[PDB]
Amino acid sequence: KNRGAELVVDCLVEQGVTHVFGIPGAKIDAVFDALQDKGPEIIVARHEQNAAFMAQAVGRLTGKPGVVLVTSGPGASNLATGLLTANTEGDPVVALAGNVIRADRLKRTHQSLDNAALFQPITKYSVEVQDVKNIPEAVTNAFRIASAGQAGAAFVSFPQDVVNEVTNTKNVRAVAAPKLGPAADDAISAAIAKIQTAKLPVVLVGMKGGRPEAIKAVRKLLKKVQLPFVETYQAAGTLSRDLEDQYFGRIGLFRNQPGDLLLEQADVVLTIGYDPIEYDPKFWNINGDRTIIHLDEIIADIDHAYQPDLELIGDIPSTINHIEHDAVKVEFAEREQKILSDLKQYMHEGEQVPADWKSDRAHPLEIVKELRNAVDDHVTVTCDIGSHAIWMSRYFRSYEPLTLMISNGMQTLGVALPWAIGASLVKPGEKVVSVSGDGGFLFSAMELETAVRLKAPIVHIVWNDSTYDMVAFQQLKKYNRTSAVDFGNIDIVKYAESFGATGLRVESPDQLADVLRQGMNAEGPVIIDVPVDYSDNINLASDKLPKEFGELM
Amino acid sequence: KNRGAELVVDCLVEQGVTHVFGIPGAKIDAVFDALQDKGPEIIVARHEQNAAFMAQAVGRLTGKPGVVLVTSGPGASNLATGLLTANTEGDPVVALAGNVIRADRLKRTHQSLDNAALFQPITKYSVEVQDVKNIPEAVTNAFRIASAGQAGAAFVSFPQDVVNEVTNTKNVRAVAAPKLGPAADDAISAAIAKIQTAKLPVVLVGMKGGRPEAIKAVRKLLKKVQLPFVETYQAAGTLSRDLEDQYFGRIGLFRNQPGDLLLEQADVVLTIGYDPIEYDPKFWNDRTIIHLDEIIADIDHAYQPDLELIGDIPSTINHIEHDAVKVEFAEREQKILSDLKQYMHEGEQVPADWKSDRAHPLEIVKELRNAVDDHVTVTCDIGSHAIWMSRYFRSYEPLTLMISNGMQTLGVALPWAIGASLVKPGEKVVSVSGDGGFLFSAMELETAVRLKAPIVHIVWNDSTYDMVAFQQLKKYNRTSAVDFGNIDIVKYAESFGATGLRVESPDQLADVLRQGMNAEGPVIIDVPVDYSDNINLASDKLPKEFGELM
Amino acid sequence: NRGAELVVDCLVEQGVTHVFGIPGAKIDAVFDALQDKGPEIIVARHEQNAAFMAQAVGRLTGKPGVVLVTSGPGASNLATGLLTANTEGDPVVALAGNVIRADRLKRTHQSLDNAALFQPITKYSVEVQDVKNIPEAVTNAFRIASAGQAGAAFVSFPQDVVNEVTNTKNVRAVAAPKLGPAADDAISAAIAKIQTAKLPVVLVGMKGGRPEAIKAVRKLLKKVQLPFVETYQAAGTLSRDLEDQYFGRIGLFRNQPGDLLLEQADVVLTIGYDPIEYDPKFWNINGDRTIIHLDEIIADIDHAYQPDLELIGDIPSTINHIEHDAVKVEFAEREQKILSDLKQYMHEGEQVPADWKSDRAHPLEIVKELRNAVDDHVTVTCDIGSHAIWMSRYFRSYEPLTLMISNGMQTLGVALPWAIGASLVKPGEKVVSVSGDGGFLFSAMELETAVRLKAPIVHIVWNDSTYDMVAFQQLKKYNRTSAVDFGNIDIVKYAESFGATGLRVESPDQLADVLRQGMNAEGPVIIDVPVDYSDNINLASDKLPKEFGELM
Ligand SMILES: Cc1ncc(C[n+]2csc(CCOP(=O)(O)OP(=O)(O)O)c2C)c(N)n1
Ligand SMILES: Cc1ncc(C[n+]2csc(CCOP(=O)(O)OP(=O)(O)O)c2C)c(N)n1
Ligand SMILES: Cc1ncc(C[n+]2csc(CCOP(=O)(O)OP(=O)(O)O)c2C)c(N)n1
Ligand SMILES: [Mg+2]
Ligand SMILES: [Mg+2]
Ligand SMILES: [Mg+2]
């Protein structure tokens, strides 16, 4: 027909977009109509929030922006949290929304608002197209800006008459966002010289160290040079089994981990793709001066606790390849060897169920271990936010890039199950596991109809506690009392069944391994009800370990 | 304790707030801690979206700002649509949110976000407090601005260190937002002269005509002067059983209603609390226009008032009422009223050729109306079911039919009914949605079960996003992205510990509804509906027919 | 019959007689269309001064001043102007070009997000994106600019929108409506609270200074015989008749007779008071008093401003309903002495010091000689600086809108362009403008406009060669000054280089003569007046409050 609506779909075609997540409405209608003619499969969502969470997951797993498409008013405003989360967690997303006609743009009329103004503080790019000719230009720049370091959200709004208008405007080439070269050579030399002269150099692998390419390079570096290392939560998957000896776990949330003590003992820290939002430098870069080398695709944020002595800004993996090429293996003096050894066995003992533990419910560590034993390396595991997620983020081993997905920017409740859906659409054929608590679960459980309608092979684990617990034990450590943390329990099994899904329940902690295998062998979506004992949770924020190791030294 | 958090709680005590809807988090948890000592009852929500909707319900039904309280980051950003909805539909709401400590406000850090900039476009008032001393001032101005005509949403954000900081700061008095006087008296006189000299003077009651005091005033005006009148959807309940004779239905959505032809035939139109968002003037609007409202009018190609009576709406109405006298109509205009009233009765009727194993929409509306007492509040969601409710479900009390008619936001029905039941203890509350919108906020059924709220939720079961579908069929002759698969509604209800009912055949409709009305605790009722008559809601038939009788 | 014509037609419907502007490419179609029909175009030398002029028209006529500019630097130069009007109750409408809609998101000459820039400093900031919407968007801009509280409205036109040919019809210029008075029972309440006061006082503020409000205020002050004070923008509330009940203009520093009056008051009635002129935390202090807020909009709650009664509605109507039903207050003995003492403190504070000697005029001598040289009805515009403090406290005004002060943003350089605006509003009358030397250069360029118009402006420069108001605050805080010194210029030959008339006061004794000589001159005249500023630190001095505190 050649409306503005067709120009939009043509862009999606040039961009190689396989799927569009959305919900139709009167203002964005022409575009949905034009998608009937061609373009990517439409995945109808049961909420624009979840549509955004789905696009985000696609962006994180593929490196090309996930696409979400919604109508005016509440269609658009329901995107806010989603885009915010994508934009602060390094995920390429492009959002396309409708608005009222240009003539009525300033009026009190149904579903009218300044779309671009709302999304301005929460995206890299937020625009509204006021001329049909401009559509291919605006859309193409949004894809590029979404993809360019640091990846985030782009939002593009269309008045209704703009996408309905007939025009002879030509499309433009989907010129892909270009790669940077590696960092300046002189900076790379300096960086190598500082690692070679260190008594205890260590690698801090961050958000953008967690991309597949970045991880491949990071592993060659760690293997050649033999550096100890830690991961941020979104760097999970850096580990391989033959790096386990050099691995000191995941830093974050509370300063009481072996990784923290290691970074403390370090005189040189090399950070890679490090976005401080995952764990503020004021928690780890303390207690003594210490050289900081910042390896990233964008310049560093200066902070009282973060003043890099060296910045290597360029393409992350290739910059790493250049350091790797000219570094050599680091020898550790006796003192540092013993520090490393001691940290390693504090790390080991942390991963164990307390010896005087007895219960009629599973311990969190038992859930974590059993889950890890029932799931092959290649399977993507998505995680929600809560105490369950602390246990997962610290103790759930991951061995491949993009196989453990955590929301460690906004810490947005409800991402797991929708993320699992997006993952299954990117990895057709594979099982996708999603893990949540019972609080965050109802934030997005509605999208179980999408999963069933798609016959997605998703396995969702609900940690059953019956409170907002991560908030509860923090309230106990601050005020020795809780507030607004309690809610009623629902029948998770019958909930799943009412959707046409499958419900299982761990009725005793010894059925855990069995019920898990069963979910994995099931056809279509499964929800698994797991009673958990959270009485150990308060110890997640303990200072015992920093204190013990303190008197060691 | 004299933290900033206590200063906040004290404002809520001073303001007479009985419920705060919320979800706790680290940056805001000091205010939640302070609520353990004194202050209103915390209602824990399963989604900040839904806490916002409930606060909207409280605001619409009491005139006092509803209060929602949330944490930083996604806690705040999840309020967006809620406050947008409230802000455009006339409901006083106060939102309170956390943010990161002042010193880290500029950094990439967990749950950080320029809160105030995000709500700037979608509220009357959006601010972040940067000094603990300023807390009582910023909160007290928020309540005032939320309530002041035209009522809307107010947003206040608090850095973590500001609510945790110990302080000597004094509270301020909750100075009530003041009412205006009536409109200028020479303006009132002018309007009385326009009505008394018109051939067919008519009243259009709008959004802010649906406040209880405005309705009581409007009824006296209608009865005394015997003017015909029409309702926007949010002015539902202006009608009294007494006034059914002068009543010409609800205007909205498509121009093809008896009310539309009436407004067209009128030489004078008195609009009361008319927010054009409910129905753009370019659809119903030569003739004289008298704009009566608590704020000045927006000028539009199709809306240029000859008279503006700006002041307190009920005051101004009374003044007009006091000095106006009965209008009597020439025979020409009586015939017009007779005909329009007749077209109106035909439209309210199930078509003659209708055959179906599912209920017609009108049969749901009729049985619902016949099963619910006039005083029972009925909330409604968004979709094809709501076109039917908005046009054909009669309301006779103020605030007993609640419709989202500024932002048309899916999912408002069930959370509104929860807010409503906390505002009217001892009463049943009815809510109506389609199956699409039901899953937008059905999570909150846990909350209704937790409170043992006497809610009866009716689900119109179709299996599609239909209101989108038949507009699509009319524009392109094909649908797109409107199909989803259905769930077992009864089992969905039972899994939450609520009661689930199902109308298995159209004749069971009366009894099943009755059963729901007498049930204990929350009830969900599955009601299959036949929508194949839905595309005629946008039909041009009636204006074409009436065109040639003239 | 383009979009540009639609814009000119709206200006005609609003009764706009003058448009202050500077042309550019993106907006020039509108400038074209103004050749055919419309209001006179006054070419400015800087978009800042065009904005100031507009503000002046708005303040003086009650209908929006109009300013028209091009895209990019044309529009951005408007920022301080609209901001100042938007915080001082002045209706202004601004019209600006932008790039074509197709190139709106591009890096291209003079492209910027116009609406976003003006959102935080206007009541109303919009961009039209369809030619049809022009009559609507503009009409609402005039009404919103006018609707109380009055201020700045900004409309932006992408270039292709005003050049586009259309058959769109215009829209009626529906006047912004009036409110009625406050509600009866509230009026009753206010009268009752006043009746039972031992010392009720009136505070006249910003919107108490419109002509109709002043007419009603004067009747109320006369009938009930209440003492009153003024905010700076409430100048001209006073009449010669009312000098007896008058306790001066409050503001800037809490050390004036008006402050002490307010402090002793048990009931304060405020009239159209915008706190920006003087924070309530400065006067509403040592003890409690009842506050009655009378205004066209609800009050801002403050730690030091929590009204017991709000009278919201049209200000002159509400004042009238109070005047009609109130009877005279009669002060007891204790309060009469109080009022008497304060009145003498007031009178002593207006006199040049005893041991004053100087080769240059003392400020009060400038204030005095200028007041006596100028008819009551003549409009006097004032700039910002130490000279303005002297003007604002001590220069009497007896007619509405004859003393204009920037008391919201305290914007430098407003005087001279405000006087240009005044003279266009009041043809055939002298207009006097007063500035310091520093603020003079902020807008002195616009003298070319005044000469080009043969405007009868008489501009007085207080010459001391420093940014003094900053400097003495710096000394009272830090015992040292910073960045307050600049060179000076020959004001007389400055004026002459523009084809204007330049006069100089070579000695304080020829002050009356050089002033009278300026009043009789044809065309613009600038006057160089050397001043001695050594007294200036005593403006922020703390003695009067202390001395009176011991007198109690
Ligand atoms: C959208 C949103 N609202 C509020 C919060 C604050 N918050 C963090 S954890 C949490 C509770 C999660 O509870 P649950 O999912 O049951 O996990 P659990 O701690 O019990 O394992 C809340 C409310 C948040 N992170 N996101
Ligand atoms: C939050 C939001 N998303 C999308 C829309 C667009 N929209 C309007 S009606 C509608 C259909 C709702 O369907 P349903 O609840 O099943 O009611 P039905 O039409 O079937 O009666 C949609 C998607 C909207 N109004 N609000
Ligand atoms: C645009 C602007 N810049 C700076 C200031 C701060 N300021 C206030 S008074 C003042 C000094 C003005 O001095 P001048 O005009 O020479 O008059 P004087 O103080 O000498 O009497 C300054 C710089 C201001 N108010 N406005
Ligand atoms: Mg839980
Ligand atoms: Mg449906
Ligand atoms: Mg000076």
> SS in 3 state form for C231-297?
CHHHCCCCCHHHHHHEEEECCCCCCCHHHHHHHHCCEEEEECCCHHHCCHHHHCCCCCCEEEEEECC
Nearest to C261 by CA among C202, C328, C329: C202
Nearest to C495 by CA among C415, C440, C423, C428: C440
* CB-based contact B432:B378 (threshold 8 Å): yes
DSSP C498: T
C71 CA distance to ligand 2 centroid (A)?
A: 42
Nearest to B45 by CA among B87, B9, B79: B79
Chain B residues within 8 A of A42 when measuring between CB atoms? 480-481
* CB-based contact B257:B391 (threshold 8 Å): yes
The alpha carbon of C268 is separated from its chain's Cα centroid by a whole number of angstroms, namely 24
Q: In CATH, what is the architecture of C179-353?
A: 3-Layer(aba) Sandwich (3.40)
Nearest to C245 by CA among C218, C224, C265, C225: C225
The structure tokens 């009238």 sit at C320
| DSSP reduced 3-state for B29 | helix
The structure tokens 């036949």 sit at B530
* CB-based contact A64:A16 (threshold 8 Å): yes
The structure tokens 């955590």 sit at A406
CA distance linking residue C298 with residue C275, whole number of Å: 12
Cα of C350 to nearest chain A Cα, Å: 53
Q: Residue B345: which residues within 8 A CB-CB, separation 6 or more?
A: none
DSSP A67: E
Q: Which residue of C has its CA nearest to A135?
A: C102
Q: Least CB-CB distance to A138: which of C100, C105, C137?
A: C105
Chain A residues within 8 A of B110 when measuring between CB atoms? 277, 280, 409-411
Chain A residues within 8 A of C137 when measuring between CB atoms? 106
Nearest to B11 by CA among B28, B30, B31, B26: B31
Query: Maximum CA pair distance of chain B?
Result: 76
CA distance linking residue B64 with residue B204, whole number of Å: 26
Helix or strand holding residue A186 (H, E): helix A185-196
CA distance linking residue C552 with residue C550, whole number of Å: 5
**Closest residue to atom 6 of ligand 3, CA basis:** C470
| DSSP reduced 3-state for B315 | helix
* CB-based contact A91:A124 (threshold 8 Å): no
| DSSP reduced 3-state for C186 | helix
**Closest residue to atom 20 of ligand 1, CA basis:** A469
Question: Looking at the domain covering B352-550, what would its CATH class be?
Answer: alpha beta
Q: From the CB of residue B437, how many other CB atoms can be counted at a distance below 10 Å?
A: 28
Q: Which residue of A has its CA nearest to B49?
A: A78
Tokens representing A171? Answer: 């499309």
Using CB atoms, list chains with 3+ pairs below 8 Å to chain B: A, C
Fold of A1-179: Rossmann fold (3.40.50)
CA distance linking residue A302 with residue B181, whole number of Å: 57
How far apart, in Å, do the first and last CA atoms of chain B sit? Answer: 75
CA distance linking residue C165 with residue B441, whole number of Å: 48
Question: CA dihedral in degrees (C534, C535, C539, C545; nearest 10)?
Answer: 140
A538 CA distance to ligand 4 centroid (A)?
A: 14
Q: Which ligand sits nearest to residue B465's alpha carbon?
A: 2
CA distance linking residue C11 with residue C5, whole number of Å: 10
* CB-based contact B504:B334 (threshold 8 Å): no
* CB-based contact B545:B342 (threshold 8 Å): no
Q: Is A102's CB within 8 Å of C133's CB?
A: yes
CA distance linking residue A143 with residue B550, whole number of Å: 57
Nearest to C413 by CA among C375, C381, C390, C452: C381
CA distance linking residue B492 with residue A521, whole number of Å: 25
Long-range contacts for A341-349 (Cβ within 8 Å, ≥24 apart)?
Answer: A342/A549, A342/A552, A343/A248, A343/A258, A343/A261, A343/A262, A343/A265, A343/A549, A344/A245, A344/A248, A344/A258, A346/A258, A346/A261, A346/A545, A346/A548, A346/A549, A347/A248, A347/A249, A347/A258
Q: Is C104's CB within 8 Å of A159's CB?
A: no
The size of chain C, in residues, is: 552
* CB-based contact B406:B86 (threshold 8 Å): no
Nearest to B398 by CA among B375, B429, B366, B426: B375
Q: Residue B402: which residues within 8 A CB-CB, separation 6 or more?
A: B57, B60, B377, B378, B379, B380, B416, B420
| DSSP reduced 3-state for C371 | helix
- B270 bridge partner residues: B203, B290
Do the strands A381-383 and A432-437 form a parallel or antiparallel pair, or are they unpaired?
parallel
CA distance linking residue C121 with residue A453, whole number of Å: 51
| DSSP reduced 3-state for C199 | coil
Q: Ligand 1 site: residues with CB under 6 angstroms?
A: A 384-388, 411-413, 436-440, 463, 465, 467-471; B 23-25, 71, 74-75, 78
Q: Least CB-CB distance to C179: which of B133, B173, B311?
A: B311
Long-range contacts for C238-243 (Cβ within 8 Å, ≥24 apart)?
Answer: C238/C396, C238/C397, C238/C398, C239/C398, C240/C398, C242/C218
Q: Residue C117: which residues within 8 A CB-CB, separation 6 or more?
A: C75, C76, C79, C125
Query: Maximum CA pair distance of chain C?
Result: 76
Cα of B496 to nearest chain A Cα, Å: 5
Tokens representing A410? Answer: 């906004």
Q: Which residues of C touch B (CB under 8 A)?
A: 132, 135-136, 139-140, 143, 147, 169, 171-172, 174, 176-184, 186, 298-303, 306-307, 310-314, 317
Using CB atoms, list chains with 3+ pairs below 8 Å to chain C: A, B
Q: Is the CB of C387 under 6 A from ligand 3?
A: yes
CATH 3.65.10.10 applies to domain A355-553: no
The alpha carbon of A436 is separated from its chain's Cα centroid by a whole number of angstroms, namely 14
How far apart, in Å, do the first and last CA atoms of chain A sit? Answer: 75
Q: Is A107's CB within 8 Å of B300's CB?
A: yes
C382 CA distance to ligand 3 centroid (A)?
A: 12
Nearest to C224 by CA among C312, C319, C290: C319
Q: Which residue of A has its CA nearest to B490?
A: A498
Chain C residues within 8 A of A102 when measuring between CB atoms? 129-130, 133
CA distance linking residue B105 with residue A506, whole number of Å: 44
CA distance linking residue C54 with residue C421, whole number of Å: 7
Q: Which residue of A has its CA nearest to C117?
A: A117
Cα of C305 to nearest chain B Cα, Å: 9
Tokens representing C74? Answer: 């044309």
Cα of A10 to nearest chain C Cα, Å: 19
Q: Residue A304: which residues within 8 A CB-CB, separation 6 or more?
A: A282
Which segments of chain A belong to CATH 3.40.50.1220?
Answer: 180-354
CA distance linking residue C44 with residue C60, whole number of Å: 19
Q: From the CB of residue A396, how many other CB atoms can be counted at a distance below 10 Å?
A: 21
Fold of B180-351: Rossmann fold (3.40.50)
Q: From the CB of residue B185, how many other CB atoms can be counted at a distance below 10 Å?
A: 15
Nearest to C493 by CA among C515, C464, C461, C526: C526
CATH 3.40.50.2300 applies to domain C1-178: no
| Interface A-C: count of C-beta contacts within 8 A | 41
Tokens representing A189? Answer: 């030399």
Tokens representing B168? Answer: 């000597």
A465 CA distance to ligand 4 centroid (A)?
A: 4
Rounded to 10 deg, the angle between the A316-326 and A185-196 helix axes is: 50
Question: CA dihedral in degrees (C27, C33, C34, C39; nearest 10)?
Answer: -100
CA distance linking residue C373 with residue C359, whole number of Å: 22
Cβ-based burial of A86 (10 A; exposed 0-12, middle 13-18, buried ≥19)? buried
- In three-state form (DSSP H/G/I as H, E/B as E, the rest C), the secondary structure along B134-176 is HHHHHHHHHHHHHHCCCCCEEEEEEEHHHHHCECCCCCCCCCC
Q: How many CA atoms lie within 13 A of B467 on its CB side?
A: 23
C425 CA distance to ligand 6 centroid (A)?
A: 29
Which atom of ligand 1 lies nearest, measured to the CA of A465?
20
CA distance linking residue C358 with residue C531, whole number of Å: 9
Nearest to C227 by CA among C351, C331, C345: C331
**Closest residue to atom 3 of ligand 1, CA basis:** B75
Q: Which residue of C has its CA nearest to B303?
A: C171
Is the C-alpha dihedral spanning C318, C321, C326, C328 positive or negative?
A: positive
CA distance linking residue B184 with residue C317, whole number of Å: 9
CA distance linking residue C274 with residue C271, whole number of Å: 9
| DSSP reduced 3-state for C435 | strand
C466 CA distance to ligand 6 centroid (A)?
A: 4
Q: Is C306's CB within 8 Å of B172's CB?
A: yes
Which segments of chain B belong to CATH 3.40.50.970?
Answer: 1-179, 352-550
* CB-based contact C245:C225 (threshold 8 Å): yes
Q: Which numeric CATH code is attached to A180-354? A: 3.40.50.1220
Calculate Rg over the CA atoms of chain A. 24
CA distance linking residue C39 with residue C139, whole number of Å: 16
Tokens representing A522? Answer: 């099931």
* CB-based contact C75:C117 (threshold 8 Å): yes
CA distance linking residue A86 with residue A207, whole number of Å: 13
Q: Which residue of B has its CA nearest to C138?
A: B299
The alpha carbon of C401 is separated from its chain's Cα centroid by a whole number of angstroms, namely 9
Tokens representing B238? Answer: 């202006």
Chain A residues within 8 A of B447 when measuring between CB atoms? 487
* CB-based contact B378:B427 (threshold 8 Å): no
Nearest to C273 by CA among C407, C143, C82: C407
Q: Is the CB of B314 under 6 A from ligand 2?
A: no
**Position B65, amino acid:** P
The structure tokens 């386990």 sit at A244
* CB-based contact C439:C383 (threshold 8 Å): yes
Nearest to C422 by CA among C47, C59, C40: C59
Q: Is the CB of B468 under 6 A from ligand 2?
A: yes
C436 CA distance to ligand 3 centroid (A)?
A: 8
Resolution in A: 2.5
Q: Which numeric CATH code is attached to C354-552? A: 3.40.50.970
**Position B367, amino acid:** E
Which segments of chain A belong to CATH 3.40.50.970?
Answer: 1-179, 355-553
* CB-based contact B476:A475 (threshold 8 Å): no
Q: Is the CB of B413 under 6 A from ligand 2?
A: no
Q: Is B80's CB within 8 Å of A84's CB?
A: no
Chain C residues within 8 A of A131 when measuring between CB atoms? 100-102, 104
Q: Is C133's CB within 8 Å of A101's CB?
A: no
